[PDB]
């Protein structure tokens, strides 16, 4: 199973100056439940922006740097190596790798942030004519989650 896993705002912003533009604890928990025990694949810049591999799952970084090495991180140098990864594989970021993978994945787990943030990194355009809405769940607002958001699982028609 090959999935995209992304949070993006109303204009598909996913990042600003190496940071997430929003603070949404419920989405981090969403990320944890989906991807714990499985595989996250990310381009080099997305990994560096995070700074450490995420615990309790395989962390795979795509880069052309043959000296890249980080404890707890498996390195690949080719898009085609993604297809040899066993198990459930989530494409995690960033804009470049999403552009390379959006036409290849089976499904996408999107968190739509119902806001307009300043961004410099974007998720590719996509149309619902190509994706069936398997589920759409509104996140709950509270104390620490103050931006409306929606969990979409989209599956390729
Ligand atoms: N929500 C997010 O996912 C976020 C993502 N991060 C932002 O991405 C911003 C723009 O960089 P972008 O190119 O989109 O990031 P990638 O993660 O896609 O990193 C791209 C890198 O992956 C590598 N890469 C991509 N495609 C390939 C490929 N086909 N073969 C080999 N390496 C590849 C290659 O690394 P390298 O220069 O070390 O070789 C390439 O430059 C960059 O500013 C990162 O900060 C944000 C934080 C929020
Ligand atoms: C969660 C946000 C998020 N949600 C969803 N549904 N999919 C995603 N792909 C990401 C994401 C992301 C990027 C890689 C990112 C950037 C970052 O820049 C600091 C910190 C984190 C991060 C810090 C702590 N724990 C998990 C992830 C993630």
């Amino acid at each position: 199973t090959l999935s995209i896993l992304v949070a993006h705002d109303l204009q598909r912003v996913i990042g600003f100056e190496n940071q997430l533009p929003w603070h949404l604890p419920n989405d981090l928990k969403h990320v944890k439940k989906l991807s714990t025990g499985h595989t996250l694949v990310m381009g080099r810049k997305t990994f560096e922006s995070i700074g450490k591999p995420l615990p309790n799952r395989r962390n795979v970084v795509l880069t052309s740097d043959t000296s890249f090495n980080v404890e707890g991180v498996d390195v690949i140098h080719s898009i085609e190596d993604i297809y040899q990864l066993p198990g459930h594989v989530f494409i995690f970021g960033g804009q470049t790798l999403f552009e390379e993978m959006i036409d290849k994945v089976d499904d996408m787990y999107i968190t739509v942030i119902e806001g307009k943030f300043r961004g410099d990194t974007f998720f590719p355009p996509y149309t619902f004519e190509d994706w069936e809405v398997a589920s759409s769940v509104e996140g709950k607002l509270d104390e620490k989650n103050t931006i409306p958001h929606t969990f979409l699982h989209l599956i390729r028609k």
Side-chain angles (χ1 to χ4, degrees), residues 59-144:
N59 292 250
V60 176
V61 177
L62 173 65
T63 176
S64 63
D65 187 348
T66 59
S67 92
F68 188 95
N69 196 278
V70 178
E71 223 264 330
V73 163
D74 299 341
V75 182
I76 62 169
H77 305 292
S78 171
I79 281 292
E80 269 83 25
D81 298 338
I82 297 178
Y83 306 119
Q84 323 308 318
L85 295 178
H88 201 170
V89 180
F90 296 88
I91 311 299
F92 201 55
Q95 165 174 349
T96 297
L97 181 67
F98 283 144
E99 279 164 8
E100 292 180 281
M101 296 305 293
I102 189 158
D103 288 333
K104 320 282 190 24
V105 298
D106 306 301
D107 60 350
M108 310 190 293
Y109 295 83
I110 299 179
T111 307
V112 178
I113 317 291
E114 321 277 354
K116 287 178 169 175
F117 294 76
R118 173 176 300 113
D120 52 29
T121 314
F122 284 80
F123 192 77
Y126 60 91
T127 174
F128 286 95
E129 321 164 50
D130 303 342
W131 302 92
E132 186 175 5
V133 179
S135 58
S136 178
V137 183
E138 294 171 27
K140 295 244 81 203
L141 296 186
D142 56 35
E143 309 119 325
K144 312 139 155 29

Side-chain angles (χ1 to χ4, degrees), residues 5-8 14 18-20 22 24 27-28 30-31 34 42 46-47 49-51 54 57 91-93 98 109-111 151:
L5 174 60
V6 64
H8 73 64
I14 69 184
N18 281 346
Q19 273 297 305
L20 294 169
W22 50 78
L24 212 43
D27 176 62
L28 290 175
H30 180 73
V31 163
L34 282 177
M42 65 199 94
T46 293
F47 173 73
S49 95
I50 298 178
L54 299 205
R57 70 216 83 172
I91 311 299
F92 201 55
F98 283 144
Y109 295 83
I110 299 179
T111 307
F151 302 104

